[PDB]
Amino acid sequence: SGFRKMAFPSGKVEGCMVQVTCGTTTLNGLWLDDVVYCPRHVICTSEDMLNPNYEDLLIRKSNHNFLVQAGNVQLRVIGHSMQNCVLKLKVDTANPKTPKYKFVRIQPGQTFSVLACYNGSPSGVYQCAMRPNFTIKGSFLNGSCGSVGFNIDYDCVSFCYMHHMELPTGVHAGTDLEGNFYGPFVDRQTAQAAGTDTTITVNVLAWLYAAVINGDRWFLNRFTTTLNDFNLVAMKYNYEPLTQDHVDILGPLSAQTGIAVLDMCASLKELLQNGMNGRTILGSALLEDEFTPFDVVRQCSGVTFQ
Amino acid sequence: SGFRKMAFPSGKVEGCMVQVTCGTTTLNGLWLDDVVYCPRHVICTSEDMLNPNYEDLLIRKSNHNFLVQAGNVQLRVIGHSMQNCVLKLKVDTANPKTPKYKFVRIQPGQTFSVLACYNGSPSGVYQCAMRPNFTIKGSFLNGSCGSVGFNIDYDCVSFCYMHHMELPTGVHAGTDLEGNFYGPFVDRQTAQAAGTDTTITVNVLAWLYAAVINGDRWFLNRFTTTLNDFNLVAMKYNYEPLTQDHVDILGPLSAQTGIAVLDMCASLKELLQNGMNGRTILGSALLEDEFTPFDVVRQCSGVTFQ
Ligand SMILES: [Zn+2]
Numbered sequence: 001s002g003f004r005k006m007a008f009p010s011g012k013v014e015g016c017m018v019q020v021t022c023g024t025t026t027l028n029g030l031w032l033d034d035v036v037y038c039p040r041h042v043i044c045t046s047e048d049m050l051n052p053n054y055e056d057l058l059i060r061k062s063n064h065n066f067l068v069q070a071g072n073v074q075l076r077v078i079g080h081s082m083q084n085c086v087l088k089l090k091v092d093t094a095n096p097k098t099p100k101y102k103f104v105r106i107q108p109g110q111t112f113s114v115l116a117c118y119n120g121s122p123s124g125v126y127q128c129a130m131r132p133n134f135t136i137k138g139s140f141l142n143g144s145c146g147s148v149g150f151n152i153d154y155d156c157v158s159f160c161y162m163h164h165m166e167l168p169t170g171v172h173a174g175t176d177l178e179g180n181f182y183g184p185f186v187d188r189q190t191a192q193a194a195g196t197d198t199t200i201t202v203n204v205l206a207w208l209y210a211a212v213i214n215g216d217r218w219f220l221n222r223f224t225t226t227l228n229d230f231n232l233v234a235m236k237y238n239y240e241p242l243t244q245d246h247v248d249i250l251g252p253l254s255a256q257t258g259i260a261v262l263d264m265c266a267s268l269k270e271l272l273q274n275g276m277n278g279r280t281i282l283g284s285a286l287l288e289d290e291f292t293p294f295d296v297v298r299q300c301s302g303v304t305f306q
Numbered sequence: 307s308g309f310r311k312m313a314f315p316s317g318k319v320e321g322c323m324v325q326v327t328c329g330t331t332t333l334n335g336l337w338l339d340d341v342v343y344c345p346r347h348v349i350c351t352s353e354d355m356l357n358p359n360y361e362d363l364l365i366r367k368s369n370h371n372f373l374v375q376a377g378n379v380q381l382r383v384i385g386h387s388m389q390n391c392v393l394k395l396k397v398d399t400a401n402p403k404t405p406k407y408k409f410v411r412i413q414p415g416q417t418f419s420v421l422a423c424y425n426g427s428p429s430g431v432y433q434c435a436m437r438p439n440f441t442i443k444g445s446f447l448n449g450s451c452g453s454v455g456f457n458i459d460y461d462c463v464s465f466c467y468m469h470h471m472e473l474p475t476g477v478h479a480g481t482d483l484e485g486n487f488y489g490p491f492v493d494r495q496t497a498q499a500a501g502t503d504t505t506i507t508v509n510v511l512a513w514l515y516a517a518v519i520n521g522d523r524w525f526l527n528r529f530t531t532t533l534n535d536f537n538l539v540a541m542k543y544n545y546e547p548l549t550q551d552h553v554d555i556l557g558p559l560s561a562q563t564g565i566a567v568l569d570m571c572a573s574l575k576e577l578l579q580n581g582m583n584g585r586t587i588l589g590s591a592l593l594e595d596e597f598t599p600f601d602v603v604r605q606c607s608g609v610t611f612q
C-alpha cells in the first residue's frame with residue numbers, strides 16, 4: 001500500500017539535456033535527434049528582456065555562435081530557426097539517446113513530471129499540475145529556463161512543457177515544444193495577469209477514491225445528490241464544474257471501490273461545508289488536486305506495463 | 307522561486323535494476339559491477355513467509371537457478387551468498403552502467419529518493435523520510451520488494467535502503483545494502499511493532515526557513531526563548547528534542563535569512579499552541595518534516611554543483 005505524489009523516472013530525459021549559450025547568456029536546452037530546442041530569450045541582453053524585438057534581436061544573431069555543451073562535448077551549431085517562442089538549432093551531431101519521443105499540448109488539469117536543470121545538468125524531479133489558469137506552481141531558480149516537463153506513460157516521452165518565465169506573482173509559465181505559450185503570457189519581463197486559479201474537481205474526486213482504496217472511510221457519509229446541486233456548490237468555493245465527461249473518466253475507480261461517482265460528490269459537498277479540515281485524508285489537511293484519475297490507476301494498481 | 311518535494315533524478319539507478327526470480331517467486335534486484343543484490347525472501351515459498359528458516363531454505367537452493375532478466379538479456383547466475391537479509395549473486399556479466407556508487411546506513415530523519423519498480427522496470431520516483439521509528443511511509447504494491455532508496459548528492463549514488471516488508475499497519479520496512487534491517491523488524495510475515503512515530507523537529511525548522519525565503523512571514527512573531535522551554539513543549543506534542551547539534555546545522559539558513567535559530571523555535575512553539583492550522587505555510591496546513599536543512603540549501607539555492 002501507500003500513496004505518494006510520484007514522478008516519472010527521468011533517466012530517458014536526462015540524456016537529452018544540454019547547456020546552451022548565446023550572445024552571452026546561458027540556459028537549458030533539449031537535444032533530440034540532432035536539433036536543440038530552447039527558449040528564444042537565450043539570445044536576449046538584459047535591457048532586452050524588458051521590451052524585446054526577437055525578430056530584430058535574432059536576424060543579427062551569429063549562426064555559428066550559439067554555444068552548446070554536454071558533459072565533455074560541445075556541439076557545433078550549424079544553424080537556426082525560431083518557432084514561435086523557441087529556437088531550433090540543427091547541430092552537427094545527433095543525440096544517440098533520442099528515445100521514442102513525441103510532442104503534446106496537454107490541457108489544464110493534466111499532470112506531468114518536471115526535470116529541473118541548472119547549467120545543463122539534472123537537479124531534481126517533481127510531479128506537478130497545469131493549473132486551470134495555465135500556470136504551474138513550481139520550483140525554479142536562476143538558470144532553470146529550458147527545463148522541460150514530460151510523461152512516459154509507456155513508450156516514453158511525451159514532452160509537454162518548457163519553462164520560460166517566473167511571473168512577478170511567483171508562479172511559472174512556459175510553452176509547449178513548438179513554442180506556443182500556455183495561457184495569456186509572453187516572454188517579456190513585464191506586467192502580466194494570470195487567471196483566478198481554481199481547484200481541479202475531477203482530480204480531487206480521484207484522490208478521494210485513492211483514499212478509500214487506502215483505508216480512508218470517515219468522509220463517506222449517508223447523503224447524496226445529482227450534479228447540479230454539487231456544481232452549484234462546487235463553484236462558490238471556486239471548483240471547476242463537473243461534467244458527465246469527468247463522470248465517465250471516474251467509472252473504473254467507481255467499479256474498483258463500489259462507490260458511485262455521485263455519492264462521492266456528496267461527501268465532497270459536505271467536506272466543503274464540514275468534514276476535511278484536520279483529521280486529514282491520506283495524511284493531508286487540504287484537498288489535493290494534483291492527481292488525475294489516471295495517476296490513481298497507474299499507481300495504486302495499474303503499475304505494470306510501462 | 308518555489309518549493310517542491312523533489313526527488314533526485316533516477317537515471318543512474320534505472321540502469322541498475324533487474325528482475326530476479328527464484329524457486330518460483332520474482333522481485334526486484336540491484337545489479338552493480340557483476341553482483342545482484344536482492345531480498346533474501348526471494349527464495350521463500352508462501353507458507354515459508356510465515357515462519358522461514360532461511361539457512362535451511364537456501365542450503366537447498368539451486369545455484370544455477372535464480373533467474374535474472376533485464377530487458378532482452380538474462381543473467382546466468384553462477385553463484386550465491388546470503389549477507390544478513392540480502393542475497394548477493396556473482397553473475398556472468400558485469401553492469402557496464404555501474405556508476406560511482408557507495409553504500410550508506412543513514413540515520414532516522416535523513417531523506418532519500420525511492421525508485422519504485424515492478425517486474426524489474428521503473429515505475430516512479432518520490433522523496434521520502436526515514437521516520438524516527440525507522441519506518442518509511444511509502445507507496446509499494448505487490449512485487450515492489452527490492453526497490454531501492456538512494457541519494458546522488460554529487461558523484462552519484464549512495465544507496466541507503468532496500469525495501470522488504472509492508473507492515474500490517476500499512477508502513478514499510480527494509481534494510482541497508484548489507485542486509486541490516488532498519489529498526490526492530492524481521493523478514494517474517496508475522497506480528498510486529500514499530501515505535502511511536504515522532505515529528506522531526508530539525509527538519510520542520512529547516513522548512514520554516516525555506517518558507518521565509520519564499521515569502522512566508524506571518525508566523526514570525528515577537529517572542530522567543532532558549533531551548534529548554536521549547537524542548538519542554540516540543541515533546542508533549544511528540545517532537546524529537548532539539549540539540550545544539552541541530553542548531554549548528556541550521557546556521558547557514560540563519561545566516562541566509564538573518565533569523566536566529568532560537569527565534570524560529572519561538573514561532574514554532576506558538577504554532578503548536580496557535581498559528582499554523584489553515585492559513586498554510588508553503589501551501590500546506592500541516593507542518594512538514596520531510597526536508598532536511600540540507601535539502602533546503604541544495605534546492606532553493608545551492609543548486610549547481612552536482
Ligand atoms: Zn530565461
Ligand SMILES: [Zn+2]
Nearest residue numbers: 333347451470
Ligand atoms: Zn517480498
